[PDB]
Subunit: 237 residues, 4 copies
Amino acid sequence: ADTIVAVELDTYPNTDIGDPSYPHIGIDIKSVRSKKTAKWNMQNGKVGTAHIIYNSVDKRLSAVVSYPNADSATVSYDVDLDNVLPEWVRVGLSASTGLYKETNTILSWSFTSKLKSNSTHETNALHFMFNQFSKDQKDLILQGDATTGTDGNLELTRVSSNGSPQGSSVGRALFYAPVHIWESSAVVASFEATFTFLIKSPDSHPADGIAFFISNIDSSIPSGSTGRLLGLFPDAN
Amino acid sequence: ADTIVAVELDTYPNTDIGDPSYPHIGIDIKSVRSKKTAKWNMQNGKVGTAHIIYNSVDKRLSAVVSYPNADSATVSYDVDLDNVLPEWVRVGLSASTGLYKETNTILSWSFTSKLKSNSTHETNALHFMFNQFSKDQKDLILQGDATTGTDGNLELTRVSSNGSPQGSSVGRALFYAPVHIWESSAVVASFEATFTFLIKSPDSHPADGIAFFISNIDSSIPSGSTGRLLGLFPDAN
Amino acid sequence: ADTIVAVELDTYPNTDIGDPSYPHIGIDIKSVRSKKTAKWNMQNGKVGTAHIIYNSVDKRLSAVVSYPNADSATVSYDVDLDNVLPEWVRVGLSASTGLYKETNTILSWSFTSKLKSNSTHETNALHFMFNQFSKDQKDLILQGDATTGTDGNLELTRVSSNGSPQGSSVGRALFYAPVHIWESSAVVASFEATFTFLIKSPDSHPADGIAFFISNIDSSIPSGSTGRLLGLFPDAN
Amino acid sequence: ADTIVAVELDTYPNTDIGDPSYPHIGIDIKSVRSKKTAKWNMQNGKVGTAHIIYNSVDKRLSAVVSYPNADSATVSYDVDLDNVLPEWVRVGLSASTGLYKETNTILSWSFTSKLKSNSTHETNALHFMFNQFSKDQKDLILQGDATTGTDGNLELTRVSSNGSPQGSSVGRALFYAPVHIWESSAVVASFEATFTFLIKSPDSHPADGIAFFISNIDSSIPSGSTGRLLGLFPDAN
Ligand SMILES: [Ca+2]
Ligand SMILES: [Ca+2]
Ligand SMILES: [Ca+2]
Ligand SMILES: [Ca+2]
Ligand SMILES: [Mn+2]
Ligand SMILES: [Mn+2]
Ligand SMILES: [Mn+2]
Ligand SMILES: [Mn+2]
């Protein structure tokens, strides 16, 4: 099976797989059963921003999510990612709907990876920033239902022409280039990701959420990972 | 045939294909016959730096090369790259040797691409920086004789274990991710590339040079493009 | 007198000092009488973005301005700024009103300056980005009527509490740190500025505009530089 | 008295003020008596690099120092800098010698400060990078014995023309612009500093070290802060 590290914006509480009984931000290490969550005051129809930060000195994966005119939600977990992830990875966004549904719209996505060595010429770096997506976005691998180009946005899950979200949808977008998160001469390794999203549902109960994920390079959508499994996990172990 | 835009650091004057009678920096638009050159005081065994800049407002491709304790060489050409290159490209380094030979060693390589749209959320961006290369550099496509990992460097052409360069060698390295250099809503499109190189030869006449290139995404080494053709062109038309 | 280089977004045509008979983008070298203009389809009450670019290799000062859902205006002028500006400068925004008036609101401002030397350790750099301004913005020098903190914005000219602009107003904001735009070992010197602005007037004829400017470090608002002189020039020579 | 947060590269063990009995990297919160140290294998005459990182989510100040062909030293301390430092600060390098002496040479210095707000337009940023210093570096405040321009370097402490360091010297360099490290709408605040240094002494026992520091904006060299007090503290409380 794939190896997954993710920050989930989980819109629907599934309490039998350990979700708290509210929308929440979570750190997922190789399981949909978050190692840590915080309450998330998700706003149906409002544009949000999530920030994800990590470094190999502090070995702490941290996330913050907010809306304009609102407080943030934040969550941290002590994990050494060198011990979880291979040396080379791909980074991605995943989203799903089930019998409950929402738009999983991404208006922007940026990622920065930095390896500082002990050489006087320290810094290796990867940085991308998407504020506009095109119908043919060749530096993304789209998986399952994901599409680009609708109002210059990334639609991770299925949306009708009417703008209405579809249930039982799963899609992901991975950056084309493998990312080097560990190197033998690196003294400091860090990454930062940001995405702005619009989760809208005609229903009082949207589902199921958006995740920023890091994976083995060859990661694909696990069979039957609609709904609560977020296109990340083959099961809820 | 492939579509090529390159800045050549041409170490060997081939006067029958229009080289001036000295080492020179050149702008190559779809031909090894530079649209413009400047005299280059190449130094056998010294670490050099080349900078390449362009923007869609000025439509001018410019390069500067220098060594520590030395003057620069610079060359400019008015070209609109939207009229030459497809919307999506790959960016690369190429090098060759012929019957005359040199090391084509790259110690570092960086590239920045920026598309600013008329949206209030203006900037799309790609940035990579290599100061260390590893034996398995998965974000590079190596072609022909190119290898990574020897003293943390990129060797574009064949080098023996003794450090001695081999003749009749051609190799390239392309960044894995396609790069988006034109987009319909872009008001300003710009790129910057930098590489530091070490061209060393036991001979008074090194050959044949290093180029930074932009190409169709599916670009490969043209048959018989050792020596004066720099791994860029199938012939000298 | 001060030494001024500016890109003007000139909202009011003053044809006796060479303004074309429409709102226009201009390059000002040591005179309010632009060395080049382009027609600007200014939109009363809409949020705009201007981009300014320059490099010491091409010696071309270029600007682009746009609104969402609208075409850009662009203007270029060949000038070597090493021949106009001292080695050390300050960079700023200026705005004015006269008997005709407008808000000169700045929602964001960024600037990047880069000096690449012939040393293997090439890059000197300055970068700032403001997306929020506070009541006490200590890294800005505010001059004349300029204030910060109203709805997290920079108000270059006087606005009443009702949001109504005042006439006969002049204000500027300069970044606190002097900027080094020429250095003896520099092989490439470049800068990029971006600002997003909101020019709103209850009148069919707003005045007088916003400028991004570079100056001697000790620059101050010239006496009587309200209206058509944009807080930049003591007169219209 | 001034308010100081510093990472010290302490070259001389003063065991009566809590130094361990070896050269060491330390975190100094308002006292020369480090809140945490790690053993530092300082190399007389070799060019080193220190990296300093912090963020307001993890509230952990971390540093790494290394040489080429050598292991790193690292040190971390949990501190919330919003509780120690004012909203506005200056950032600096300090160095001293006493009766034991060393060169306190800086070949390069960079700093990045980022405030991400809950606004859709998230990022405020300051970034500077010095790889070359000039005799008149107007974006630095030099204090005590500090000078710029000798071989394009920053000399924090007194050096004769022969290159020989002087004892009983103290000097600092602060970036000219105040830096905004806390803002009321900020959801994430982070900084990164890097400097490369050359500590050389004709003696087997060099003294006293280099520090990266953050201070009240009006910070000056405390009276009698040569030697073990590093130009940071008026005493060893
Ligand atoms: Ca759930
Ligand atoms: Ca040739
Ligand atoms: Ca006018
Ligand atoms: Ca000490
Ligand atoms: Mn969950
Ligand atoms: Mn040639
Ligand atoms: Mn005008
Ligand atoms: Mn100490």
